[PDB]
C-alpha cells in the first residue's frame, strides 16, 4: 500500500540494408534485416511473448511473426517503408503489447550501407508479481 514499483527494460530495434551484388529477378536492389533484441545480448525472451513485424503489403505474407529469438526478418526489396513492430509480453494485464513505427530506410547505390540502432526504454508501473519476476530476468 505504501510501496510502489516501476520496472524499466531496454529494447533495441534496428536494421541493416545493403545494395546487392546483382538485383533479383523483380528488380530488388537491397538485402535488409530488421530486428528487436535487448542491449548487451540480454535475454528479453524472459518477458517477450512474440514479436510481430508488419511488412508492407507488397511482400508475400507481410505479417512476420517470431515467437522465439532471434526476433528478426531478413528480406530483399527496393524501397524503404514504415514498418510497424509489435512486441507482445508474457503478461496478462495491459499493456499486453507495445507498438513502434520503425523506419526501414535504404541508402542509394554508391552510399554507405545502413547499420541503424534505435533505443527504447519501456517502463511498467507496478506489474503483477509474476510479470515483475520475469521482467527482472
Amino acid at each position: 500500500m505504501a510501496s510502489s514499483c516501476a520496472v524499466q527494460v531496454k529494447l533495441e530495434l534496428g536494421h541493416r540494408a545493403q545494395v546487392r551484388k546483382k538485383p533479383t529477378v523483380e528488380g530488388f536492389t537491397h538485402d535488409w534485416m530488421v530486428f528487436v533484441r535487448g542491449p548487451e545480448h540480454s535475454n528479453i525472451q524472459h518477458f517477450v511473448e512474440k514479436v510481430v513485424f508488419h511488412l508492407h503489403e507488397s511482400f508475400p505474407r507481410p505479417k512476420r511473426v517470431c515467437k522465439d529469438p532471434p526476433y528478426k526478418v531478413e528480406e530483399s526489396g527496393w524501397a524503404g517503408f514504415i514498418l510497424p513492430i509489435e512486441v507482445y509480453f508474457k503478461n496478462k494485464e495491459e499493456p499486453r503489447k507495445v507498438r513502434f513505427d520503425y523506419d526501414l530506410f535504404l541508402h542509394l547505390e554508391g552510399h554507405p550501407p545502413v547499420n541503424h540502432l534505435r533505443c527504447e526504454k519501456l517502463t511498467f508501473n507496478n506489474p503483477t508479481e509474476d510479470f515483475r519476476r520475469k521482467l527482472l530476468k
Partner: peptide, 6 residues
C-alpha cells in the same frame, strides 16, 4: 536515401 513506398 532511396525511394519510399506507401
Amino acid at each position: 536515401q532511396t525511394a519510399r513506398k506507401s
